């Protein structure tokens, strides 16, 4: 199923969690106390790291960023990884940015378990 449905997934997941009113320590985020890396997908093929960091600083400082562009033509592949300073910031970003429309392209945001350093 095409990825915008995979944004629908995470947003439904959040709202269901609030719907059952479940406590934060057992909130689905809790399984990643061990990661400051969050995946961005669906970025337009134009955004560079300047704009990405600028916008996503809104919840903290960024330790690292890796934007996978195709090396042969250098051009952005439209998805990236982001290492925030403190897990809580990534929780906030996953909550708030999952589904924002940038240049028409609705970007999807998520946790990352085992970020691979390339």
């Amino acid at each position: 199923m095409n990825p915008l449905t995979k944004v629908k997934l995470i947003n439904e997941l959040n709202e269901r969690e609030v719907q059952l009113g479940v406590a934060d320590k057992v909130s689905w985020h809790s399984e990643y106390k061990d990661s400051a890396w969050i995946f961005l997908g669906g970025l337009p093929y134009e955004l560079t790291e300047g704009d990405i960091i600028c916008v996503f600083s809104q919840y903290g400082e960024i330790v690292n960023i890796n934007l996978v562009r195709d090396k042969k033509t250098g051009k952005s592949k439209g998805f990236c990884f982001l290492c925030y300073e403190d897990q809580r910031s990534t929780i906030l970003a996953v909550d708030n940015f999952n589904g924002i429309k940038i240049k028409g392209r609705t970007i999807r945001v998520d946790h990352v378990s085992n970020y691979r350093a390339p």
Partner: protein, 55 residues
């Protein structure tokens, strides 16, 4: 430590400062404010329904 200095960072659960070069405009699904408002209104209806419990 260049720190955000611009006008007004909206509140969060953790109330953390936006980054050094935060482009400085609010782009957010609003889910923050939704959860805040619902957070207050839960307490509101708690009080309102208690007042009935004693009646």
């Amino acid at each position: 430590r260049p720190r955000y200095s611009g006008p007004a960072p909206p509140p969060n659960r953790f109330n953390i400062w936006p980054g050094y070069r935060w482009d400085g405009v609010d782009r957010s699904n609003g889910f923050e404010q939704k959860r805040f408002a619902r957070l207050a209104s839960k307490k509101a209806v708690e009080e309102l329904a208690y007042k009935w419990s004693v009646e």
